[PDB]
Design a protein around this ligand. Structure first.
Ligand SMILES: CCCCC(=O)N(Cc1ccc(-c2ccccc2-c2nn[nH]n2)cc1)[C@H](C(=O)O)C(C)C
Ligand SMILES: CCCCC(=O)N(Cc1ccc(-c2ccccc2-c2nn[nH]n2)cc1)[C@H](C(=O)O)C(C)C
Ligand SMILES: Nc1ncnc2c1ncn2[C@@H]1O[C@H](COP(=O)(O)OP(=O)(O)O)[C@@H](O)[C@H]1O
Length: 324
């Protein structure tokens, strides 16, 4: 029961708008944002410690959940022991602590879901697991974006202001993951569906690619796997996966349409649950794909919607909010 955690457990988070972040693209500005990072990170960690303290006693007593709760406390202690930033030199000392804590250990997400699974006999709230894991995933993504962005503001990459790409092409980032997915699918079945990309193929806009690097390969794997399992009798003649890009002033829509047989009526109300799967930080398998991708899409101001045509295929709509 530590009092420093209690002091910031209810303190509202301060999130800089990506628009404001793009404007800071800078010695006097890096000092101001570095001071902000130092003071924000313990508040984000204390919110998650408060989450562990609020679990029902029997669940919070799981040795895996308890071990993860201790990891959060130890991280809070390391981030608060560091003295307040006064100059550019103090700002640069804090970046190095941030890097060592970001690349730290365990694979917390994996341990948490394991602990929650071991405690399922004591879980009465049908939504407790889904809510705890959504909050854990979006909070850790928020922490990652906060820390990785500030570190990247010191480095100079073309077309980037920190982790924000100023000229992101959805077609290029989709193509990058299509090639990765097709190689894995080809190795497994001896073939892979071809992926066509249509719509606003020349669209380019400011966006943060990091969450797409989890979402796109997962959805592509889902569509390609469903197509192959659906056409096992003709494995060398399978229908294409068709991706459409729609770009407007409000959002970017990526529709991924397959002919993989659809998501059955009996599984539809389970596909968005953690651990639900029909296959034989956040993980890519074990039923994490869809709930993680949806939590990420909604955290970023968009959504992940599914339309199942049982017997034919599925259309998956990823919508993401524009920055300006
Ligand atoms: C209409 C504005 C849409 C902007 C948006 O996507 N929003 C969430 C968000 C904000 C900030 C980040 C972020 C980006 C880079 C580096 C760190 C952070 C961050 N994340 N957590 N702390 N810092 C990510 C998502 C909204 C907001 O909050 O402005 C909400 C209202 C939908
Ligand atoms: C300055 C870091 C403060 C936060 C911190 O120290 N930690 C959370 C954390 C760590 C790593 C990531 C991360 C980094 C790279 C790639 C993926 C992820 C990730 N991981 N999950 N989603 N994204 C995010 C958050 C602890 C830990 O987890 O080590 C805990 C014990 C407080
Ligand atoms: N495009 C799709 N077509 C058919 N079934 C799908 C599709 N996308 C997802 N599914 C179903 O939803 C389940 C859960 O998906 P997901 O959360 O990504 O986990 P995983 O990929 O680890 O199985 C899949 O195992 C599969 O049964």
């Amino acid at each position: 029961n530590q009092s420093a955690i209690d002091v910031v457990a209810e303190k509202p988070s301060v999130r800089l708008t990506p628009t404001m972040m793009l404007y800071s693209g800078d010695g006097s500005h890096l000092l101001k944002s570095g001071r902000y990072l130092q003071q924000e990170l313990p508040v984000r960690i204390a919110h998650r410690i408060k989450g562990f303290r609020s679990l029902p006693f029997i669940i919070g007593c799981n040795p895996t959940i308890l071990h993860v709760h201790e990891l959060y406390i130890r991280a809070f202690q390391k981030l608060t022991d560091f003295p307040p930033i006064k100059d550019q030199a103090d700002e640069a000392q804090y970046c190095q602590l941030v890097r060592q804590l970001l690349d730290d250990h365990k694979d917390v997400v994996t341990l948490l879901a394991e602990g929650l699974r071991e405690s399922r006999k004591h879980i009465e709230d049908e939504k407790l697991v889904r809510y705890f894991l959504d909050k854990t995933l979006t909070s850790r993504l928020g922490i990652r974006m906060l820390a990785t962005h500030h570190l990247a503001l010191h480095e100079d990459k073309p077309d980037f202001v920190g982790i924000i790409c100023t000229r992101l092409s959805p077609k290029k980032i989709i193509e990058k993951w299509v090639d990765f997915a097709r190689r894995l699918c080809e190795h497994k079945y001896g073939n892979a569906p071809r992926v066509r990309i249509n719509g606003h193929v020349a669209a380019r806009f400011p966006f943060i690619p990091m969450p797409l690097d989890y979402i796109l390969p997962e959805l592509l794997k889902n569509a390609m796997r469903a197509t192959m399992e659906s056409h096992l009798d003709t494995p060398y003649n399978v229908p294409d996966v068709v991706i459409t890009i729609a770009n407007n002033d409000v959002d970017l829509i990526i529709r991924i349409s397959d002919r993989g047989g659809g998501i059955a009526h009996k599984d539809l109300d389970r596909v968005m649950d953690y651990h639900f799967t029909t296959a034989e930080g956040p993980m890519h398998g074990f039923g994490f794909g869809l709930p993680t991708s949806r939590a990420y899409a909604e955290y970023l101001g968009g959504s992940l919607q599914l339309q199942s045509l049982q017997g034919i295929g599925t259309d998956v709509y990823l919508r993401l909010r524009h920055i300006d």
